[PDB]
A paper describes a structure:
CHD4 is an essential, widely conserved ATP-dependent translocase that is also a broad tumour dependency. In common with other SF2-family chromatin remodelling enzymes, it alters chromatin accessibility by repositioning histone octamers. Besides the helicase and adjacent tandem chromodomains and PHD domains, CHD4 features 1000 residues of N- and C-terminal sequence with unknown structure and function. Auto-inhibition is relieved by a previously unrecognized C-terminal SANT-SLIDE domain split by ~150 residues of disordered sequence, most likely by binding of this domain to substrate DNA.
After generating many constructs covering the region 1200–1912, we were able to successfully express and purify a protein comprising residues 1380–1810, but lacking residues 1552–1689. These residues form part of what is predicted by PONDR25 to be a disordered segment of ~160 residues in length (residues 1540–1700). Furthermore, our X-ray crystal structure of C1bC2a reveals a SANT-SLIDE domain that closely resembles the structure observed in both CHD1 and ISWI. First, no clear electron density was observed for the residues that constitute the bulk of the second helix of the SANT domain (α2 in human CHD1). Second, a β-hairpin that links α3 and α4 in human CHD1 has ‘relocated’ to a position N-terminal to the first helix in hCHD4; Fig. 5B shows the high sequence similarity between these two elements. Third, the SLIDE domain features an additional N-terminal helix in hCHD4. To test this hypothesis, we titrated 46w60 nucleosomal DNA (without histones) with purified CHD4(1380–1810) in an MST experiment. Figure 5C shows that WT C1bC2a can bind DNA with micromolar affinity, consistent with our hypothesis that the C-terminal region of CHD4 harbours a SANT-SLIDE like DNA-binding domain.
Numbering used by the authors: 1400 to 1439, 1445 to 1468, 1488 to 1520, 1696 to 1808
Write the structure that this text describes.
Amino acid sequence: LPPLLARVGGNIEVLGFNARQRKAFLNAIMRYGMPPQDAFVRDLRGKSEKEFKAYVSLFMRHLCSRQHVLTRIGVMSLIRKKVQEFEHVNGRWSMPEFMFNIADGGFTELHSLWQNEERAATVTKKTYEIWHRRHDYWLLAGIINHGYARWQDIQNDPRYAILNEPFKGEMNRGNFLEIKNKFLARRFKLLEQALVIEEQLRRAAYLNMS
């Protein structure tokens, strides 16, 4: 109901939103992506649902850092599709107290990585201590529950303790929290690619026919 463009108290408000709300919004979009139609907001605490969608749809038109926001919003949607695809069979706890695949068609090293990694996880039976396909699901699951590139919030969550298990050897190293963060970032960057490639493969399979 507020005006798209207005001047109140010495500042410009876009649909009732001040810069503080306007900046906060973007920060929460880069971190979580777009809420799917509806979903659970700090500076925007007082904002209502009525005003919320007013901004989103108005933000949408704007989109079509312009590309930056576009890709981050899309990527986070790709991750949400994948996690939801297998959420049921895997549960919500990595190490309690399984199924996962990404169809990149062999265009990223992932499938070759997964093969070698899963060989050792099975022959040694050390499932949680050898990073493999299983760990990438829970890495992706964390990126949704906790946000984009939130390695520390993900690590501290018991739900994703599997991500910590392959690195118990270097707990005494001063840089410990870094080595982990550098592995997760280098890993998620690959997953990001495979996720995007799988989408381009699904979309081209339709030959541009809905």
